[PDB]
């Protein structure tokens, strides 16, 4: 059911063979962005979207 929902809302758009060596400089940027979002969301609590 989870995979059917994932397909049916069209999350994927590239549609290629997902085998790509991601550099550390990219994993770091994504981790820092996500951590900053987490810190700001926890410090500024949204009463409807935790």
């Amino acid at each position: 059911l989870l995979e059917a929902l994932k397909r049916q809302k069209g999350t994927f758009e590239t549609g290629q063979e997902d085998s790509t060596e991601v550099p550390e400089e990219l994993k770091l940027r994504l981790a820092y962005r996500e951590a900053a979002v987490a810190v700001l969301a926890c410090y500024l609590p949204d009463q409807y979207r935790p």
């Binding site: 049916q8 758009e13 590239t14 549609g15 290629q16 063979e17 790509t20 991601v22 550099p23 550390e24 400089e25 990219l26 770091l28 940027r29």
Partner: protein
């Protein structure tokens, strides 16, 4: 009428498949193991749509899946449905689906649905009404009333945004598979299968040919195979090698190499231009790996060119740094830098006018692309003063790249003269000799730290500061 004979194409005939091939054999499973599919209570998905760049051979995939399915194959051009007369196209679709249902089990293929799948209400004419009628007829024969459970339609489009969302409704076209451009291994296997019909050698390495021709479709690889047959009889060698493939790729991506009469100062000017580009590029990270350097005029470009192959992952996704563009603008401005530093300010030429505008366009795209630091990005304002100041930062950015190019090219005069002399004498240069000259006469290029070193020093500074805070709390409290 719409039935074809002799469909022997299989999955082995087609290369560059990948995991999409799995879905393809899933379709074959839909044509073979459907008994347990309907036993469990699964309605067979009729609509599968292949979307991708042209020349990847979508119709070839259709022949492959039809041959592996072992059913009747229908291949109908969508251009025959649109006509100046109305009603006849609807009858054509009716006869098509009726003979598909009579020939069950079967698979039907229609290519380039953008001609007839256009959203209704975009053109005002009788052709639009006929297109609407044909779309309605195919919609009804697809899902309208009961009577089809065995006929499966396969389609091949290029632009998925043009299609009517009514067609994209599940039960009509629910499986959407994208066929990407072949990567490295895909180009390898496409070259192999397109070259199986010709006698090849055992020392033939497709790795260099695949890495040389990056970002091209399978039709272009078939073309590379087609320029692997015509050009060796000029010299008359024995067996095909990788050198002919490399030269064929070089000819295809740029044009045929033609020689014309030329003076010495013209060659010197093209040489110092190419030297400016390569010498300013090698000291920058994103354009460091210069592999080729020639001043030979080609089709459409009387100039030479510098060949670099940067990482092609950050460029597509958009993870290029701000410094990565300030470096490229300097690279585009450096031909004018060499011209000014060699022929003086009063004798500027017009050969660098194609890079000098690319630099200013890149600066303009940078300043209103949110990458600046004036307030914080903020590419749009309201009052006229800030709108006028928006275009000031682009010109100052060009000026600072301009002085940076002057400094970079002035640091490297000896290697400049050496590479200009070599470019005039040989008319071409590869990576090894150019880099050897760079190591012989290069200046110091202190590399700025990457993001890893910055993260490490920031982390250790943060840890030492937080433990300093810990002791200033503890020993003052204890």
């Amino acid at each position: 009428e719409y039935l074809e004979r002799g469909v022997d194409v299989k999955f082995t005939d087609v290369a560059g498949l990948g995991k999409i091939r799995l879905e393809l054999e899933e379709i074959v499973k839909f044509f073979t193991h459907g008994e347990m599919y309907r036993r469990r209570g699964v309605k067979i998905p009729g609509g599968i749509l292949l979307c991708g760049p042209p020349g990847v051979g979508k119709t070839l995939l259709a022949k492959a899946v039809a041959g592996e399915a072992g059913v009747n194959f229908f291949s109908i051009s969508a251009s025959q449905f649109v006509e100046i007369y109305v009603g006849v196209g609807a009858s054509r679709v009716r006869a098509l689906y009726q003979e598909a249902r009579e020939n069950a089990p079967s698979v039907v293929f229609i290519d380039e649905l953008d001609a007839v799948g256009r959203e209704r209400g975009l053109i005002k004419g009788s052709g639009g009404q006929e297109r609407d009628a044909t779309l309605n007829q195919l919609l009804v024969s697809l899902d309208g009333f009961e009577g089809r459970g065995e006929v499966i339609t396969i389609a091949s489009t290029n632009r998925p945004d043009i299609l009517d969302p009514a067609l994209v409704r599940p039960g009509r076209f629910d499986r959407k598979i994208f066929i990407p451009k072949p990567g490295l291994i895909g180009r390898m296997e496409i070259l192999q299968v397109h070259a199986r019909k010709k006698p090849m050698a055992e020392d033939l390495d497709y790795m260099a040919v695949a890495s040389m021709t990056d970002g091209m479709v399978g039709a272009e690889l078939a073309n590379i195979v087609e320029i692997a047959a015509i050009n060796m009889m000029r010299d008359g060698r024995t067996e095909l090698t990788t050198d002919d493939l490399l030269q064929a790729a070089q000819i295809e991506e740029r044009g045929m190499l033609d020689r014309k009469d030329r003076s010495l100062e013209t060659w010197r000017q093209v040489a110092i231009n190419e030297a400016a580009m390569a010498v300013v590029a090698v000291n920058f990270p994103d354009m460091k790996n210069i592999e080729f350097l020639t001043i030979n005029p080609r089709a459409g470009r009387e100039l030479g060119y510098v060949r670099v192959k940067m990482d092609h992952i950050k460029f597509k996704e958009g993870m290029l740094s701000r410094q990565s563009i300030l470096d490229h603008i300097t690279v585009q401005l450096a031909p004018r830098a060499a011209d000014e530093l060699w022929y003086g300010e009063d004798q500027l030429s017009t050969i660098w006018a194609e890079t000098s505008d690319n630099a200013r366009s890149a600066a303009r795209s940078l300043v209103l692309g949110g990458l600046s630091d004036k307030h914080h990005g903020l590419n749009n304002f309201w009052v006229a003063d800030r709108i006028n100041d928006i275009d000031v930062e682009a010109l100052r950015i060009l000026n600072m790249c301009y002085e940076r190019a002057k400094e970079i090219l002035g640091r490297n005069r000896t290697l400049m003269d050496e590479v200009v002399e070599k470019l005039v004498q040989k008319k071409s240069l590869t990576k090894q000799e150019f880099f050897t000259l760079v190591e012989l006469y290069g200046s110091s290029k202190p590399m700025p730290p990457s993001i890893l070193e910055l993260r490490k020093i920031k982390r250790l500074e943060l840890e030492e500061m937080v433990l300093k805070l810990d002791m200033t709390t503890a020993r003052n409290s204890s």
